[PDB]
Structures are given as structure tokens and as C-alpha cells.
Write a protein that binds this ligand. Sequence first.
Ligand SMILES: Cc1cc2nc3c(=O)[nH]c(=O)nc-3n(C[C@H](O)[C@H](O)[C@H](O)COP(=O)(O)OP(=O)(O)OC[C@H]3O[C@@H](n4cnc5c(N)ncnc54)[C@H](O)[C@@H]3O)c2cc1C
Ligand SMILES: [Cl-]
Ligand SMILES: [Cl-]
Ligand SMILES: [Cl-]
Ligand SMILES: [Cl-]
Ligand SMILES: [Cl-]
Ligand SMILES: [Cl-]
Ligand SMILES: [Cl-]
Ligand SMILES: [Cl-]
Ligand SMILES: [Cl-]
Ligand SMILES: [Cl-]
Ligand SMILES: [Cl-]
Ligand SMILES: [Cl-]
Ligand SMILES: [Cl-]
Ligand SMILES: [Cl-]
Ligand SMILES: [Cl-]
Ligand SMILES: [Cl-]
Ligand SMILES: [Mg+2]
Length: 246
Amino acid sequence: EAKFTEEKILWVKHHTPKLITFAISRPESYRFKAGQFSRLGFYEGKGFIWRAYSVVSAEYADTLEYFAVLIQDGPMSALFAKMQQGDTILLDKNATGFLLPERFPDGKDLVMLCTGSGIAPFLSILEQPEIRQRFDTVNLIHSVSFPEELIFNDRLAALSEHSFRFVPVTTRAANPSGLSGKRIPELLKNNSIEQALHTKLTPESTRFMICGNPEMVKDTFQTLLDMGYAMHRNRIPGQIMMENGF
Ligand SMILES: Cc1cc2nc3c(=O)[nH]c(=O)nc-3n(C[C@H](O)[C@H](O)[C@H](O)COP(=O)(O)OP(=O)(O)OC[C@H]3O[C@@H](n4cnc5c(N)ncnc54)[C@H](O)[C@@H]3O)c2cc1C
Ligand SMILES: [Cl-]
Ligand SMILES: [Cl-]
Ligand SMILES: [Cl-]
Ligand SMILES: [Cl-]
Ligand SMILES: [Cl-]
Ligand SMILES: [Cl-]
Ligand SMILES: [Cl-]
Ligand SMILES: [Cl-]
Ligand SMILES: [Cl-]
Ligand SMILES: [Cl-]
Ligand SMILES: [Cl-]
Ligand SMILES: [Cl-]
Ligand SMILES: [Cl-]
Ligand SMILES: [Cl-]
Ligand SMILES: [Cl-]
Ligand SMILES: [Cl-]
Ligand SMILES: [Mg+2]
């Protein structure tokens, strides 16, 4: 039949004026792997608008949750700003994406590097019980500009205290819980992330996932290549998986 279903907005939560999470109804048939993204849409007049969002809720949850940043003059953002419980939202029947951590072998140290809304797929991955079982440590570094944008900080700091480590990074504001004033590629170069994790990072033992703004993803990838890491490919184990967050 159609390539999508009509779902309902269940609720919208403002964490700041411009950062929302929201939940939608989940059809019985909708399957995804943690780390993948949905395509969400609205009827607009006689046409459509569609955008991709990483699922932030657990694979086993009974709803689908998403984390969206509201962009000035952005067309989907204007619709998100007006939507409310009971409104129709369209859900593409297929989930997509290759941020699939179980393609890395058990026993490694998993290091997730993200910016902004790029934390979203890693939230779903952290809800998989087997991820902290399979990997020796699970580490999440979330870079934003200002500490107000660390909207999962209280939750992830509490989970932090097979260890889970959370390192917040604020690139434009000085936060005397994490690291401040520098972006993730620089913090890899100067060993600050390794020091914050209290875990030596090596190509043999570390496996990276990257999700963030395109410039950060590129700069982080190139930095890791300089440090001796390689992309995961079909036949290459490698140490890096990456996806642009927009
Ligand atoms: C695979 C994939 C996964 C995505 N996952 C998410 C997600 O989990 N959460 C989310 O909020 N967005 C996500 N995005 C972006 C999302 O699809 C939209 O682009 C976003 O909601 C803005 O839509 P818009 O129509 O208001 O603006 P658009 O017309 O789509 O974009 C306008 C401009 O806003 C900027 N922009 C867009 N999205 C972002 C963002 N998230 N952070 C910073 N700047 C941005 C870009 O400069 C873009 O050119 C994803 C995109 C892709 C391709
Ligand atoms: Cl609502
Ligand atoms: Cl599923
Ligand atoms: Cl959930
Ligand atoms: Cl903006
Ligand atoms: Cl509606
Ligand atoms: Cl797979
Ligand atoms: Cl970002
Ligand atoms: Cl956060
Ligand atoms: Cl500034
Ligand atoms: Cl700038
Ligand atoms: Cl400051
Ligand atoms: Cl960064
Ligand atoms: Cl090594
Ligand atoms: Cl960018
Ligand atoms: Cl390459
Ligand atoms: Cl290959
Ligand atoms: Mg499964």
C-alpha cells in the first residue's frame, strides 16, 4: 500500500524555547534498530514535507520519541513549533541508517562522539541492555555551544555514577562537569577525551561512532585517520562509523 502511515502526536516537551522532544504513536509493524532514523512528514496543502529524525526512544518502547532543534526560518521547524497532541504526523514505514554498534566486536571500548541533536541515535543505543554487556566501556561525549543545550545532562550524569561515562563539552561557554572552549577534534588531538574517560584509546581497543554537524563529522574523521584509525566498511573491521546529523 502506501509508503507511510498516519500517526498522532502524543506530546511535545520544551526543554528550552528551541529544543523539544516529542512522542508519536508507533504502529505494531514499525521495526527499527537502535541508532537508525525515521522519516517524518506532514500533509501541506495538496503536497508533503518530509524530514529525517533519529529515534531517541528504545527499540522496545510502545511509542516513538524524537529530539528536534527548532531552526530559524526552517519549514519543518515552523510546523513542529505549532503542533500539539492529537495532530496527524506521517511516519515512513522504513527506518534507515548504519550507526549500528553491534557490527563492532564485543569487548572493545565504545566511544560515541556527537554534537547537538546528533546525540539522538546514541540515546536509543544506550537504551539497549546488551550494549553495556557487550562492550567493555560505553562512553558518550556530547558537544554543544552552551550548557543550556545539554538537555540530557542530568540523566546521563546520573547513569555515569562495564562502566558508562558521559562527558559534556561546551564549545562557547566555560561548564570550571566537562571540558569547555574546544571542539571534539581538538580534544582528541590533545588527549583530553582520553583523560576524561580514564581509558587509553588505541586502534586495537577503541571503536568510534560519530554523529553531528557535517563539519564536525568531517573534522573528527580526519583527526582519527591521523591518529591511526580507519573507517568500518563491508569487509574492513575498522574503528569508525559516522553519520551527518543533518
Ligand atoms: C539522517 C538525518 C538525521 C537527522 N536527525 C535529526 C535529529 O535527530 N534531530 C533534528 O533536530 N534534526 C535531525 N536532522 C535534520 C532534520 O531532518 C531537519 O533538517 C531539521 O528538523 C530542520 O528542518 P527544517 O525544515 O526546519 O530546516 P531545513 O530546511 O531542513 O534546514 C535548514 C538548515 O538548518 C540547519 N539544520 C537542520 N537541521 C539541523 C540540526 N538538527 N541541527 C543544527 N542545524 C540544523 C542546516 O544548516 C540546514 O541547512 C536529520 C537529518 C538527516 C539527514
Ligand atoms: Cl502537546
Ligand atoms: Cl523493533
Ligand atoms: Cl523510550
Ligand atoms: Cl537557528
Ligand atoms: Cl492534523
Ligand atoms: Cl547489522
Ligand atoms: Cl550541531
Ligand atoms: Cl546532554
Ligand atoms: Cl558566542
Ligand atoms: Cl562560530
Ligand atoms: Cl561562559
Ligand atoms: Cl565539537
Ligand atoms: Cl593499537
Ligand atoms: Cl556544518
Ligand atoms: Cl577512508
Ligand atoms: Cl570493503
Ligand atoms: Mg533488536
